[PDB]
Amino acid sequence: SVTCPGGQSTSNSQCCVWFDVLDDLQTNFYQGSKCESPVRKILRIVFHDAIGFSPALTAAGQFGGGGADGSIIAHSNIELAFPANGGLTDTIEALRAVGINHGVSFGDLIQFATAVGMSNCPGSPRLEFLTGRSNSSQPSPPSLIPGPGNTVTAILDRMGDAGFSPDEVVDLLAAHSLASQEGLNSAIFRSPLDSTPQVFDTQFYIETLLKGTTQPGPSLGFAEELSPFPGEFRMRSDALLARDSRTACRWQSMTSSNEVMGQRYRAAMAKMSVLGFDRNALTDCSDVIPSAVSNNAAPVIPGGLTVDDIEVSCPSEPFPEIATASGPLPSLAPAP
Ligand code: HEM
Ligand SMILES: *[C@@H]1O[C@H](CO)[C@@H](O[C@@H]2O[C@H](CO)[C@@H](O)[C@H](O)[C@H]2NC(C)=O)[C@H](O)[C@H]1NC(C)=O
Ligand SMILES: *[C@@H]1O[C@H](CO)[C@@H](O)[C@H](O)[C@@H]1O
Ligand SMILES: [Ca+2]
Ligand SMILES: [Ca+2]
Asked: Count of CB atoms within 10 A of residue 178's CB?
């Protein structure tokens, strides 16, 4: 519908400032539209910002949190002291400056930087982007972010309170396909959670299901489990969710199709992006988001392992026929 100063067409005039913050983020924050640590840090940030939302606290007369309100930036002084928010300060400050410089709300800016960051990573779906979240927020209550040492019952209860079913919890975890850890075992800094930390694919669901065989570092870190090969890090909650009877069949269904996985993830992220808001009050500016390059590789069981190495945990469905690869066991380099 309208033409923005740069000659681009958009549906609403409210979308025109976003082409300018698109260029800034791609050039600066993402260092030339790359899919590296700034994208992975922003994905941790959008979850940690959005999940500080609790209907139960509200119901009990307490402030339950404003959801996707950018409070992790406006109140970084209190929220970055939370256990789950370590290693985010440098990214929060960079985002703060962009927000202030373009006059956009912090909650909107985090949703936008997630959609734009994912467009730099092959295989990603185009995420919906809505604008209009108010810039005013209050600090998130503590203890609303799931931890890697939490039991599955604990994660599903916290996630369920926020509004997600067990299925959507598994769908949301597709973001660990673009992930590493820095603070759980600092000895193997940026060890990847799957073999393709720069490709949004199904490898994370396949690989967390393989039998834990290797200790990748000198010792085990917090909430660390044995992984299937050198260089890969396996987190306890991911290992447990892969195997728990409440989430095992959805986890298994996510292994053979990158198309189904992307579809499910996009839908769960659209829900997470408006926690604390009425989406009918927001303006759709999804047309600003660029397409990612396609991922043409097929799902594989890496380095000589076969179906006999995966710990099938969904009792009702047989494991999908996934291709195997020859070669020895891969050793993963740190995520860039
Ligand atoms: C079931 C809840 C989840 C738990 C317990 C969990 C836990 C963690 C932990 C402990 C790390 C490592 C952080 C570090 O030491 O550097 C991590 C990394 C990451 N998580 Fe999650 N996560 C969960 C859900 C999600 C969701 C829903 C998203 C986003 C949609 C997400 C995106 C990421 C990303 C992209 C990274 C990689 C960060 C990097 O490489 O620097 N996580 N997660
Ligand atoms: C959104 O709200 C925050 C306040 O929570 C505003 O951020 C401040 O902006 C001024 C300049 O305008 C800076 O000097 C402060 O350092 C900022 N504070 C924080 C905590 O970041 C922000 O400007 C507001 N944005 C809009 C568009 O209203
Ligand atoms: C596999 O090799 C990589 C480097 O290629 C290491 O990061 C890993 O620890 C393992 O030796
Ligand atoms: Ca928040
Ligand atoms: Ca991947």
From this structure: 29
